[PDB]
Protein backbone atom coordinates (compact mmCIF):
# COMPACT_ATOMS: atom_id res chain seq x y z
CA UNK A 1 0.00 0.00 0.00
CA UNK A 2 1.24 3.62 -0.98
CA UNK A 3 -0.12 6.98 0.85
CA UNK A 4 0.90 10.22 -0.99
CA UNK A 5 -0.25 12.93 1.97
CA UNK A 6 -0.24 16.36 1.07
CA UNK A 7 0.25 19.09 3.93
CA UNK A 8 1.21 22.33 4.39
CA UNK A 9 4.76 23.00 4.48
CA UNK A 10 6.34 24.65 8.00
CA UNK A 11 6.35 21.60 10.19
CA UNK A 12 9.47 20.24 11.56
CA UNK A 13 11.50 16.91 10.43
CA UNK A 14 10.31 15.14 13.75
CA UNK A 15 6.70 16.07 13.56
CA UNK A 16 6.79 14.93 9.63
CA UNK A 17 8.61 11.62 10.70
CA UNK A 18 6.19 11.22 13.79
CA UNK A 19 3.50 11.63 10.47
CA UNK A 20 5.30 9.02 8.29
CA UNK A 21 5.35 6.65 11.66
CA UNK A 22 1.83 6.94 12.82
CA UNK A 23 -0.22 7.10 9.94
CA UNK A 24 1.95 3.62 8.56
CA UNK A 25 0.77 2.68 11.90
CA UNK A 26 -2.74 3.41 10.83
CA UNK A 27 -2.30 2.20 7.52
CA UNK A 28 -1.40 -1.35 8.74
CA UNK A 29 -3.72 -1.40 11.51
CA UNK A 30 -7.05 -1.40 8.86
CA UNK A 31 -5.76 -3.56 6.77
CA UNK A 32 -3.70 -6.30 8.42
CA UNK A 33 -1.10 -5.45 5.97
CA UNK A 34 2.18 -5.81 7.02
CA UNK A 35 4.06 -2.99 8.37
CA UNK A 36 7.20 -3.27 6.35
CA UNK A 37 4.66 -3.28 2.91
CA UNK A 38 3.77 0.23 3.98
CA UNK A 39 4.85 3.26 2.05
CA UNK A 40 4.44 7.02 2.91
CA UNK A 41 5.85 9.72 0.95
CA UNK A 42 5.35 13.07 1.61
CA UNK A 43 4.65 16.62 -0.28
CA UNK A 44 4.60 19.60 1.17
CA UNK A 45 2.53 23.01 0.13
CA UNK A 46 3.35 26.84 0.25
CA UNK A 47 0.52 28.71 1.57
CA UNK A 48 0.66 30.45 -2.13
CA UNK A 49 0.30 26.66 -3.42
CA UNK A 50 -3.25 25.47 -1.82
CA UNK A 51 -6.96 26.61 -1.58
CA UNK A 52 -9.89 26.43 0.06
CA UNK A 53 -13.16 27.61 -1.50
CA UNK A 54 -10.78 29.36 -4.21
CA UNK A 55 -8.64 31.23 -1.39
CA UNK A 56 -5.21 30.73 -0.09
CA UNK A 57 -4.87 28.71 3.00
CA UNK B 1 -4.02 18.04 4.55
CA UNK B 2 -5.16 15.27 2.11
CA UNK B 3 -3.22 11.62 1.72
CA UNK B 4 -4.56 9.55 -0.91
CA UNK B 5 -3.97 6.01 -0.49
CA UNK B 6 -3.19 3.34 -2.79
CA UNK B 7 -4.06 -0.17 -1.98
CA UNK B 8 -4.57 -3.56 -3.46
CA UNK B 9 -8.38 -4.41 -4.39
CA UNK B 10 -9.93 -7.30 -2.49
CA UNK B 11 -9.92 -6.08 0.95
CA UNK B 12 -13.40 -5.39 3.03
CA UNK B 13 -16.01 -2.14 3.05
CA UNK B 14 -15.30 -2.07 6.91
CA UNK B 15 -11.74 -1.98 6.66
CA UNK B 16 -11.76 0.85 4.07
CA UNK B 17 -14.19 2.59 6.42
CA UNK B 18 -11.56 2.15 9.46
CA UNK B 19 -8.70 3.29 7.31
CA UNK B 20 -9.94 6.62 6.47
CA UNK B 21 -10.50 7.06 10.36
CA UNK B 22 -7.61 6.11 11.67
CA UNK B 23 -5.62 7.70 9.02
CA UNK B 24 -7.18 10.89 9.23
CA UNK B 25 -6.88 10.82 13.39
CA UNK B 26 -3.25 10.12 13.12
CA UNK B 27 -2.68 12.87 10.43
CA UNK B 28 -4.63 15.17 12.92
CA UNK B 29 -2.72 14.16 15.86
CA UNK B 30 1.03 14.08 14.47
CA UNK B 31 0.22 17.88 12.72
CA UNK B 32 -2.37 18.99 15.76
CA UNK B 33 -5.20 20.12 12.95
CA UNK B 34 -8.74 19.83 13.15
CA UNK B 35 -9.94 16.75 11.86
CA UNK B 36 -12.40 18.24 9.49
CA UNK B 37 -9.67 19.49 7.66
CA UNK B 38 -8.31 15.91 7.09
CA UNK B 39 -9.80 14.40 3.30
CA UNK B 40 -8.56 10.96 2.40
CA UNK B 41 -8.84 9.08 -0.63
CA UNK B 42 -8.67 5.29 -1.42
CA UNK B 43 -7.85 4.00 -5.08
CA UNK B 44 -7.75 0.35 -5.59
CA UNK B 45 -5.86 -1.32 -7.86
CA UNK B 46 -6.80 -4.73 -9.77
CA UNK B 47 -3.63 -6.98 -9.84
CA UNK B 48 -3.09 -6.07 -13.59
CA UNK B 49 -2.79 -2.69 -12.62
CA UNK B 50 0.18 -2.90 -10.20
CA UNK B 51 3.90 -3.68 -10.24
CA UNK B 52 6.99 -4.14 -7.87
CA UNK B 53 9.62 -5.92 -10.03
CA UNK B 54 7.86 -5.19 -13.42
CA UNK B 55 6.24 -8.32 -12.51
CA UNK B 56 2.40 -7.98 -11.49
CA UNK B 57 0.44 -8.51 -7.98
CA UNK C 1 -0.49 21.68 -17.23
CA UNK C 2 -2.23 19.14 -16.02
CA UNK C 3 -5.03 19.23 -13.79
CA UNK C 4 -6.41 15.81 -11.86
CA UNK C 5 -9.60 16.87 -10.30
CA UNK C 6 -10.88 13.57 -7.68
CA UNK C 7 -14.53 13.90 -7.13
CA UNK C 8 -17.18 12.00 -5.56
CA UNK C 9 -19.05 9.69 -7.71
CA UNK C 10 -23.10 10.56 -8.90
CA UNK C 11 -22.26 13.44 -11.37
CA UNK C 12 -23.73 13.88 -14.93
CA UNK C 13 -21.91 13.18 -18.22
CA UNK C 14 -22.51 16.65 -18.93
CA UNK C 15 -21.56 17.82 -15.66
CA UNK C 16 -17.90 16.38 -16.13
CA UNK C 17 -17.55 17.53 -19.92
CA UNK C 18 -18.34 21.06 -18.38
CA UNK C 19 -16.01 20.49 -15.58
CA UNK C 20 -13.23 19.62 -17.99
CA UNK C 21 -14.16 22.34 -20.07
CA UNK C 22 -14.66 25.72 -17.52
CA UNK C 23 -11.46 24.21 -15.58
CA UNK C 24 -9.36 23.97 -18.89
CA UNK C 25 -10.14 27.76 -19.98
CA UNK C 26 -9.11 28.85 -16.50
CA UNK C 27 -5.97 26.79 -16.04
CA UNK C 28 -5.55 28.71 -19.86
CA UNK C 29 -6.62 32.01 -18.54
CA UNK C 30 -4.97 32.50 -15.33
CA UNK C 31 -1.83 31.15 -16.06
CA UNK C 32 -1.77 32.71 -19.74
CA UNK C 33 -0.77 29.27 -21.77
CA UNK C 34 -2.51 27.68 -24.94
CA UNK C 35 -5.69 25.89 -24.04
CA UNK C 36 -4.37 23.14 -26.02
CA UNK C 37 -1.63 22.64 -23.63
CA UNK C 38 -4.49 22.02 -20.63
CA UNK C 39 -5.10 17.91 -20.31
CA UNK C 40 -7.23 17.63 -17.64
CA UNK C 41 -8.23 14.30 -16.23
CA UNK C 42 -11.23 12.79 -13.70
CA UNK C 43 -11.15 9.98 -11.07
CA UNK C 44 -14.50 9.53 -9.80
CA UNK C 45 -14.52 7.93 -5.82
CA UNK C 46 -17.71 6.00 -4.57
CA UNK C 47 -18.69 7.40 -0.97
CA UNK C 48 -16.72 4.80 0.90
CA UNK C 49 -13.68 5.81 -0.75
CA UNK C 50 -13.45 9.08 -0.01
CA UNK C 51 -13.32 10.80 3.86
CA UNK C 52 -13.22 13.47 6.06
CA UNK C 53 -12.15 13.87 9.60
CA UNK C 54 -13.55 10.21 9.84
CA UNK D 1 -13.63 17.77 -4.51
CA UNK D 2 -10.12 17.90 -5.09
CA UNK D 3 -8.02 19.14 -7.40
CA UNK D 4 -4.29 18.86 -8.35
CA UNK D 5 -2.49 20.92 -10.49
CA UNK D 6 0.76 20.55 -12.26
CA UNK D 7 2.57 23.31 -14.00
CA UNK D 8 6.08 24.70 -15.09
CA UNK D 9 7.36 27.06 -12.51
CA UNK D 10 8.36 30.40 -13.02
CA UNK D 11 4.84 32.23 -12.27
CA UNK D 12 4.02 34.88 -10.35
CA UNK D 13 2.31 34.69 -6.91
CA UNK D 14 -0.64 36.56 -7.99
CA UNK D 15 -1.10 34.30 -11.09
CA UNK D 16 -1.07 31.42 -9.05
CA UNK D 17 -3.42 32.76 -6.63
CA UNK D 18 -5.64 33.74 -9.50
CA UNK D 19 -5.20 30.04 -10.69
CA UNK D 20 -6.53 28.64 -7.49
CA UNK D 21 -9.23 31.17 -7.17
CA UNK D 22 -10.88 30.77 -10.88
CA UNK D 23 -9.98 26.85 -10.89
CA UNK D 24 -11.84 26.48 -8.00
CA UNK D 25 -15.15 28.56 -9.10
CA UNK D 26 -15.03 26.70 -11.86
CA UNK D 27 -15.28 23.33 -10.20
CA UNK D 28 -17.86 24.44 -8.24
CA UNK D 29 -20.12 26.12 -11.22
CA UNK D 30 -19.78 22.76 -13.57
CA UNK D 31 -20.37 20.64 -10.10
CA UNK D 32 -22.78 22.68 -8.38
CA UNK D 33 -20.66 22.23 -5.32
CA UNK D 34 -20.30 24.38 -2.67
CA UNK D 35 -17.21 26.43 -3.42
CA UNK D 36 -15.55 26.32 0.28
CA UNK D 37 -15.87 22.02 -0.90
CA UNK D 38 -13.19 22.49 -3.22
CA UNK D 39 -9.96 21.85 -2.58
CA UNK D 40 -6.71 23.08 -5.00
CA UNK D 41 -2.96 22.41 -4.05
CA UNK D 42 -0.39 23.85 -7.14
CA UNK D 43 2.53 21.72 -7.95
CA UNK D 44 5.21 23.26 -9.71
CA UNK D 45 7.75 21.35 -12.12
CA UNK D 46 11.34 22.57 -12.77
CA UNK D 47 12.20 22.53 -17.10
CA UNK D 48 14.48 19.56 -16.45
CA UNK D 49 11.49 17.34 -14.69
CA UNK D 50 9.07 17.81 -17.11
CA UNK D 51 8.76 15.90 -20.87
CA UNK D 52 6.64 15.94 -23.82
CA UNK D 53 7.79 12.98 -25.64
CA UNK D 54 10.67 12.39 -24.04
CA UNK D 55 12.30 15.68 -24.69
CA UNK D 56 12.13 17.98 -21.58
CA UNK D 57 9.40 21.05 -21.62
CA UNK E 1 10.57 4.87 -7.13
CA UNK E 2 7.12 4.72 -7.68
CA UNK E 3 5.16 5.36 -11.52
CA UNK E 4 1.75 6.51 -11.44
CA UNK E 5 1.18 6.15 -15.10
CA UNK E 6 -2.64 7.81 -16.22
CA UNK E 7 -3.94 6.17 -19.41
CA UNK E 8 -7.36 6.43 -21.33
CA UNK E 9 -9.17 2.90 -20.68
CA UNK E 10 -9.02 0.15 -23.61
CA UNK E 11 -6.35 -1.50 -23.03
CA UNK E 12 -5.42 -5.16 -22.95
CA UNK E 13 -4.28 -7.16 -19.54
CA UNK E 14 -1.18 -8.29 -21.69
CA UNK E 15 -0.23 -4.52 -23.08
CA UNK E 16 -1.18 -2.96 -19.54
CA UNK E 17 1.08 -6.19 -18.06
CA UNK E 18 4.22 -4.73 -20.97
CA UNK E 19 3.73 -1.32 -19.62
CA UNK E 20 4.81 -2.38 -16.35
CA UNK E 21 7.65 -4.25 -17.04
CA UNK E 22 9.01 -1.65 -19.78
CA UNK E 23 8.47 1.09 -17.70
CA UNK E 24 10.10 -0.50 -14.74
CA UNK E 25 12.97 -1.76 -16.65
CA UNK E 26 13.58 1.86 -17.70
CA UNK E 27 12.94 3.55 -14.42
CA UNK E 28 16.07 0.60 -13.16
CA UNK E 29 17.93 0.75 -16.44
CA UNK E 30 18.08 5.00 -16.04
CA UNK E 31 18.47 4.95 -12.44
CA UNK E 32 20.90 2.18 -11.87
CA UNK E 33 18.42 0.83 -8.83
CA UNK E 34 17.35 -2.25 -8.38
CA UNK E 35 14.22 -3.39 -10.00
CA UNK E 36 12.57 -4.58 -7.42
CA UNK E 37 12.36 -1.33 -5.60
CA UNK E 38 10.53 -0.40 -8.92
CA UNK E 39 6.79 0.28 -8.36
CA UNK E 40 4.23 1.33 -10.72
CA UNK E 41 0.79 2.05 -10.53
CA UNK E 42 -1.79 2.09 -13.80
CA UNK E 43 -5.22 4.06 -13.45
CA UNK E 44 -7.79 4.05 -16.20
CA UNK E 45 -9.58 6.87 -17.59
CA UNK E 46 -13.24 6.95 -19.40
CA UNK E 47 -13.02 9.24 -22.63
CA UNK E 48 -15.33 11.59 -20.55
CA UNK E 49 -12.86 11.70 -17.86
CA UNK E 50 -10.10 13.03 -19.77
CA UNK E 51 -9.72 16.38 -21.67
CA UNK E 52 -7.66 18.04 -24.06
CA UNK E 53 -7.83 21.62 -24.34
CA UNK E 54 -11.16 22.09 -22.75
CA UNK E 55 -12.60 18.96 -25.13
CA UNK E 56 -12.47 15.13 -24.60
CA UNK E 57 -9.84 13.57 -26.30
CA UNK F 1 -0.65 8.93 -21.13
CA UNK F 2 0.93 10.90 -18.11
CA UNK F 3 3.63 9.19 -15.77
CA UNK F 4 4.59 11.32 -13.01
CA UNK F 5 7.37 9.23 -11.42
CA UNK F 6 8.23 9.59 -7.66
CA UNK F 7 12.09 9.51 -6.95
CA UNK F 8 14.43 10.14 -4.03
CA UNK F 9 16.31 13.80 -4.91
CA UNK F 10 19.92 13.64 -5.14
CA UNK F 11 20.27 12.56 -8.80
CA UNK F 12 21.97 15.19 -11.49
CA UNK F 13 19.76 16.99 -14.45
CA UNK F 14 21.41 14.87 -16.97
CA UNK F 15 20.29 10.96 -14.99
CA UNK F 16 16.83 12.82 -14.98
CA UNK F 17 16.52 13.95 -18.70
CA UNK F 18 17.81 10.09 -19.41
CA UNK F 19 14.53 8.77 -16.88
CA UNK F 20 12.04 10.72 -18.86
CA UNK F 21 13.04 10.07 -22.05
CA UNK F 22 13.26 6.16 -21.70
CA UNK F 23 10.24 6.28 -19.29
CA UNK F 24 8.77 7.97 -22.34
CA UNK F 25 10.13 5.46 -24.84
CA UNK F 26 8.73 2.40 -22.68
CA UNK F 27 5.16 4.06 -22.69
CA UNK F 28 5.13 4.55 -26.21
CA UNK F 29 6.14 1.17 -26.94
CA UNK F 30 4.04 -0.96 -24.68
CA UNK F 31 0.85 0.98 -25.84
CA UNK F 32 1.04 1.77 -29.05
CA UNK F 33 0.80 5.06 -28.24
CA UNK F 34 2.55 8.33 -30.16
CA UNK F 35 5.48 9.44 -28.64
CA UNK F 36 4.40 13.21 -28.61
CA UNK F 37 1.22 12.21 -26.76
CA UNK F 38 3.37 11.21 -23.53
CA UNK F 39 3.45 13.34 -20.67
CA UNK F 40 6.25 12.54 -17.81
CA UNK F 41 6.88 14.64 -14.55
CA UNK F 42 9.17 14.00 -11.56
CA UNK F 43 8.42 14.82 -8.04
CA UNK F 44 11.87 14.44 -5.90
CA UNK F 45 11.36 13.24 -2.28
CA UNK F 46 13.90 14.17 0.51
CA UNK F 47 14.90 11.53 2.82
CA UNK F 48 13.21 13.00 5.72
CA UNK F 49 9.98 12.07 3.61
CA UNK F 50 9.93 9.08 2.23
CA UNK F 51 9.09 6.34 4.44
CA UNK F 52 8.86 2.55 4.26
CA UNK F 53 7.44 0.88 7.69
CA UNK F 54 7.31 3.83 9.54
CA UNK F 55 10.77 4.59 9.29
CA UNK F 56 12.71 6.77 6.78
CA UNK F 57 15.34 5.48 4.06
Given amino acids: ???????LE????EQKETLI???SEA???SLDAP??????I???YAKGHAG??????
Avoid at 10 to 13: A, K, L, V
Avoid at 35 to 40: I, K, M, Q
Fill in 10 to 13: GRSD
Fill in 35 to 40: LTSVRV
Fill in 1 to 7: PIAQIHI
Fill in 27 to 29: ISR
Fill in 42 to 44: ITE
Fill in 52 to 57: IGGELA
Fill in 21 to 23: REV
